Amino acid sequence: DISTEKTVESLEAIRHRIAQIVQSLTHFLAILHQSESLSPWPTIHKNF
Amino acid sequence: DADISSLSLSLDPEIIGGQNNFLENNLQQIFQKIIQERGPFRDLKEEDLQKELQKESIKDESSAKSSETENVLEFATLDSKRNVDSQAYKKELI
Amino acid sequence: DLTSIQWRMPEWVQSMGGLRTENVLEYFSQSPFYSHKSNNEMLKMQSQFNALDLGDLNSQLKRLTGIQFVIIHERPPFLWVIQKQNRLNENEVKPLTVYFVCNENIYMAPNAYTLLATRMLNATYCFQKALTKIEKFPQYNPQEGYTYPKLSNDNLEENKNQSIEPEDFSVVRAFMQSLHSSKEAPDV
Amino acid sequence: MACRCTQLQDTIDEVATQFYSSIHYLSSHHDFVSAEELQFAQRDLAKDLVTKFMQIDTLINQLPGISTAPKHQLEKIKKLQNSIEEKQLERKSLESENEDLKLQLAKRIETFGRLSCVLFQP
Amino acid sequence: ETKWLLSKVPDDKSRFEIELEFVQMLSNPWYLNFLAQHKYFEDEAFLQYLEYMEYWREPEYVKFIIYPTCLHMLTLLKNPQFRNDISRADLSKQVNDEIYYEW
């Protein structure tokens, strides 16, 4: 019976991590969108 | 029956017969064909008059070229489909 | 193969006019997804023996051991839930895939982990690919710093603090600002 | 519209279905204690259906191509093309025949446009 | 000289038959997407579209029945180059035909 709890819980953690990486990478792409030209390479490595 | 060609007007009795005139039509045209920039094109309007002059002098007095026939002329377009950076890295990354 | 792919012989449905109840397992019997030592098919063999002794489905099915394709959630007139299973007893069940009427298709239900792994792999692949045909163009220098070689740069074109003791707009920015003030200057 | 005899058929076979509609009122409504009024509805059908038939006859009255001679009505179309096919390029030739003058005449309008501009600024 | 011999096992009577017979199957906008695999698209597949050009001609034109095929024909005539032979245009493309079906 525990498995449903495993679903809601562990997938809550998973969807949380997804909510992190996705929208944070929107913030990332936006940082790229700051570009009049050159990208901040070290910053990009920080992103990675 | 050339009126069957005029039945395009009968098609205009069956349709609006396209938007025809439009400033936007002049905008895609601002993109389309030689040259570009309507002001610069206006500077080119005399040169455009030159385009209507001897630039169009080419005519028809040569071999029919059977090798060109027929749908293979499109196959040449397929040959175009085959035989024919800053930001861009970041672009494709996006 | 078992995912979003065509497998259709519509004319059967054209004859049937669509599904009813047990006839879903008919077109499903046409499907590869149908199992031969399923209780649906070994008791199809019973139909080739007893014939009459099958009832609807689940009565003859679940009481007898083996692979089965039980019905639980109809979704008229398109989907119909039909899970694969393996009875180990007249009472016990060991359910498998939920085969489902994808309409002129029926599929095994994918693992979440499969698509999740697809996402992880493709994403980290985008990371690595970002590291591929992009990296090592800004060559490092202690002095010059990262460098960006070109046939022509244009387009466009931890150190020191103390030193010797455009504005591409010709102050055009403030001029435009003044235009904002001035367009309604008579008006305001 | 056309083939309006088929539209009459819409008042035939479909009216024939209307007889089927008339049929379904006597299944068991009698001794299970109106149908008497339903007989007046039968009178209403005696009106409706028959008048529809009269309408059918009225559209029969004016079948297009009363001459009913396609063998010769197509010949009528032949004469009509004897007119039209002649008129085709002739009527459109007038277009170019006009513009050959009138385009340059419009630029003449532009030249008196020059002089109008001269009048603009004394 | 022996292009027919290039076939692994074909040659075939071919003729007019399966041509138009599949041209009506070309008609479906829903069919568009599947062509985004490997069966045919912008590769050597393009030749199919470049030789199926004959329909506008007399005789072949009569046997056309579902001008939705003529509208997919419009798609090839249009820059299918673009998303029309790529991303365009989901189920709505069928609606784009359904509207043509509606009118």
Swiss-Prot record, chain A:
Disulfide bonds: none annotated. It is found in: Nucleus. It comes from the Eukaryota. Signal peptide: none annotated. Belongs to the Mediator complex subunit 8 family. Component of the Mediator complex. Component of the Mediator complex, a coactivator involved in the regulated transcription of nearly all RNA polymerase II-dependent genes. Mediator functions as a bridge to convey information from gene-specific regulatory proteins to the basal RNA polymerase II transcription machinery. Mediator is recruited to promoters by direct interactions with regulatory proteins and serves as a scaffold for the assembly of a functional preinitiation complex with RNA polymerase II and the general transcription factors. This is Mediator of RNA polymerase II transcription subunit 8. It comes from Schizosaccharomyces pombe (strain 972 / ATCC 24843) (Fission yeast). The lineage of its organism: Eukaryota, Fungi, Dikarya, Ascomycota, Taphrinomycotina.
From Swiss-Prot, chain C:
Keywords: Activator, Nucleus, Transcription, Transcription regulation. GO terms for molecular function: transcription coactivator activity. It is found in: Nucleus. It comes from the Eukaryota. Disulfide bonds: none annotated. Belongs to the Mediator complex subunit 6 family. This is Mediator of RNA polymerase II transcription subunit 6. It comes from Schizosaccharomyces pombe (strain 972 / ATCC 24843).
UniProtKB/Swiss-Prot annotation, chain D:
It is found in: Nucleus. SUPFAM superfamilies: Mediator hinge subcomplex-like. GO terms for molecular function: transcription coactivator activity; transcription coregulator activity. Keywords: Activator, Coiled coil, Nucleus, Transcription, Transcription regulation. The keyword Lyase does not apply. One of its GO terms (biological process) is positive regulation of transcription initiation by RNA polymerase II. It comes from the Eukaryota. GO terms for cellular component: mediator complex; nucleus. Residues 71-112 form a coiled coil. Signal peptide: none annotated. Its main location: nucleus. InterPro entries: Med7/Med21-like, Mediator_Med21. Component of the Mediator complex. Belongs to the Mediator complex subunit 21 family. Component of the Mediator complex, a coactivator involved in the regulated transcription of nearly all RNA polymerase II-dependent genes. Mediator functions as a bridge to convey information from gene-specific regulatory proteins to the basal RNA polymerase II transcription machinery. Mediator is recruited to promoters by direct interactions with regulatory proteins and serves as a scaffold for the assembly of a functional preinitiation complex with RNA polymerase II and the general transcription factors. This is Mediator of RNA polymerase II transcription subunit 21. It comes from Schizosaccharomyces pombe (strain 972 / ATCC 24843) (Fission yeast).
From Swiss-Prot, chain E:
The keyword RNA-binding does not apply. It comes from the Eukaryota. Keywords: Activator, Nucleus, Transcription, Transcription regulation. GO terms for biological process: positive regulation of transcription initiation by RNA polymerase II; regulation of transcription by RNA polymerase II. The keyword Nucleotide-binding does not apply. One of its GO terms (cellular component) is core mediator complex. GO terms for molecular function: transcription coactivator activity. Component of the Mediator complex. Component of the Mediator complex, a coactivator involved in the regulated transcription of nearly all RNA polymerase II-dependent genes. Mediator functions as a bridge to convey information from gene-specific regulatory proteins to the basal RNA polymerase II transcription machinery. Mediator is recruited to promoters by direct interactions with regulatory proteins and serves as a scaffold for the assembly of a functional preinitiation complex with RNA polymerase II and the general transcription factors. Belongs to the Mediator complex subunit 31 family. This is Mediator of RNA polymerase II transcription subunit 31. It comes from Schizosaccharomyces pombe (strain 972 / ATCC 24843). The lineage of its organism: Eukaryota, Fungi, Dikarya, Ascomycota, Taphrinomycotina. The chain holds residues 2 to 104 of 139 of the full protein.
